Every structure is written in structure tokens, then in C-alpha cells.
Amino acid sequence: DGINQSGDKAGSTVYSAKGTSLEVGGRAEARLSLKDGKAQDNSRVRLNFLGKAEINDSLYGVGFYEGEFTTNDQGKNASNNSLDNRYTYAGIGGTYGEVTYGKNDGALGVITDFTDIMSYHGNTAAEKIAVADRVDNMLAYKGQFGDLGVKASYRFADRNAVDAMGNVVTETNAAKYSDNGEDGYSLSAIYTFGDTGFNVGAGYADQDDQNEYMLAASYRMENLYFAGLFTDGELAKDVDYTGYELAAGYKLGQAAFTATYNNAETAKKTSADNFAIDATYYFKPNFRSYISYQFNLLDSASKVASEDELAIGLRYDF
């Protein structure tokens, strides 16, 4: 929402009665991708259901689901069984923040959000490890204390069943329970400096052989926005990752224009090097069109890995 143009918007209230509400939201987002003059339909629908029940003025319960649905006809009127259950959680919140269990966001998304401002492109050099991103078996916390926003998460290792040598098997055939070692945590903080338009952010995450930190800053004036983000860590034992993003935005009437630069290195070789620009027209707050171009600055990476991309989108938010 807002400057994070690709993010979900709040849904429509379909039931409300007695501090209890049901909001149905999501989107129908038509997306045409053009690479080497060849089209791919990257359209997606999301459907989401957010229930909130006020328990008292200090406390509320929440439930949330979101699914994403796509097609891949390849030229036939095919049956398309493409579903991703993006979110499945319940939680409790109040004046001291909100805590959930189930698949939900970890702490670093609101840091990557400093530079993730484009309708389609961008966010290519800010890889989030699972516990920092969105993942199940996870306790997720968010709170806002004046000008300070904090998020945190803690993921449990997933239970599995193993034989007497440690091979993973069906429970019926197992000798004992073990786990996959995929416990982890994430933490972030954002400080908004009053009404100045200046925000800073930082965070960290760790999960088995993966770890990272992030630093960001942004400055918002009346119709202009600037931001930078830095990520550094390991994606595996002896696989370094470092990424940098810059973002700029300008708003003119109902239109928003953005540009980003994204550069990442994986194992000390460049893995992303993108300059992208876009334009997004808001007819209404829930109906928009956009056009975006990614200059892919990798070159002879493979031919396919170095191709530029044009994207054209029409987005309706439920």
C-alpha cells in the first residue's frame, strides 16, 4: 500500500457488527511481460479474508488468510490448479503490538519496503532469508511506540521423523522424531523523525547457515521520495551475499513515477544489476495502470539471464 505500490491494500468490509469485522480484499492484477519481444501472462489474483474481534479496548483477536491464483494455459483452455496459500495465521494484539502464529511476515519486509516502491520491478537486490521474509512455524510480532516501529519473529525448527541412522522417513517407519534445524529469528526497527519526512531502519535475521543484516534510510518531501537499502550476509556456509538498492519517486497529479537501481553479488559475483523505471496511473485508489522497463545490465551471465523486460499492468484491488 501507499509508496509500496506492489503491496496489498486493505480490503472491503463485508460484515461489521459489535467491534467484530470481516474484510475481503486482494486483487485482480493483469500483467503482460515482454522479453525479447515475446509475451508472458504473469497475471495474478489474490483473495484475502481478515477478521478482527475487539475483545476490550486493550485487546483484539485476528485471523487472516491470503491465496494467490494464476493461470498457465500455454494456448489451450486448460484446467489451472495454481494456488499459493501466502498467509495462514491467527494472532492477538493490543496497545503493545500484535503477535501471530502461522505463515506470516518476518521482520525485514518493512526494511526492504524502503526501496520496494515500484509497481512491478525493483526489490531485486534485497534477498530476505525465510524467517525474515514469510514462513510458517513462526511467531511474528509487530508494534509501534510513538515514532519507533519494531518487528520480530522466531521460527521453530520443523519436527520430522527419522530412522536409526538419521534418514528422514514416514512417521510409521521412523525410529524417533528429530527436526530439520530450520529454527531462526528476525528483528527490525524503524524510526520516523516526527514530521520531517526522514526515516531510518535496520534489521537482522539468522536461520541455520543463513544470516543477514539490513540498513536503510528514506526521505519523503511533498511529491518526491528518495531511499537507499543495504543488505549483507550469507545464503549458505561460504556463500556471501551483498546487495544495494537506490530508489526515487515522483508524484504528479494521479501519476506516480519511480526509478530504482539494484545491485547484488552472490559468492562475490554479480547476480543482479538492474536499472528500472516505471509509471503508474491511479484512476482510483483501487484501480490503476502501469508500465515498467527493466534495463538488465548483466551481459555476456547467459543471454536469457541478461535480457531486459517491459511490463504492462492493470490492477484492480478488491
Q: Which residues bind ligand C8E (CB under 6 A)?
A: 30, 32, 34, 37, 101, 139, 191, 193-194, 196, 198, 200, 246-248, 253, 255, 259-261, 275, 279, 281, 289-291, 312-314
Nearest to 41, CA basis, from 27, 29, 50, 52? 29
**Shortest distance, position 32 Cβ to a second copy, whole Å:** 6
Q: Please state the closest distance from residue 115 (CB atom) to a second copy, in A.
A: 19
3 binds, among a second copy, ligand C8E, none (CB under 5 to 8 A by kind): none
C-beta closer to a second copy: residue 73 or 147: 73
Q: Report the distance separating Cα 229 and Cα 186, nearest Å.
A: 17
Q: Which is nearer to a second copy, 109 or 149 (CB)?
A: 109
Give 5's Cβ-side CA count (13 Å radius). 32
Return the closest-CA partner of residue 262 out of 224, 227, 223, 289. Answer: 227
Query: Pick from ligand C8E, a second copy, none: which does 267 bind, CB < 5 to 8 A by kind?
Result: none
Query: Which entry of ligand C8E, a second copy, none binds 239, CB below 5 to 8 A by partner kind?
Result: none
Q: Which is nearer to ligand C8E, 39 or 78 (CB)?
A: 39
Instruction: Pick between residue 76 and residue 269 the one whose CB is nearest to a second copy.
Output: 76
Contact 121, 80 (CB under 8 A): no
Q: CA 33 to CA 229: how far, in whole Å?
A: 26
Helix segments in 218-302, DSSP class H: none
- Report the nearest approach of a second copy to the CB of residue 67 (Å): 7
Is 24 or 289 the residue whose CB approaches ligand C8E more closely?
289
Give per-residue burial for 42-52: e unless 16+ CB within 10 Å, then b.
ebbbbbbbbeb
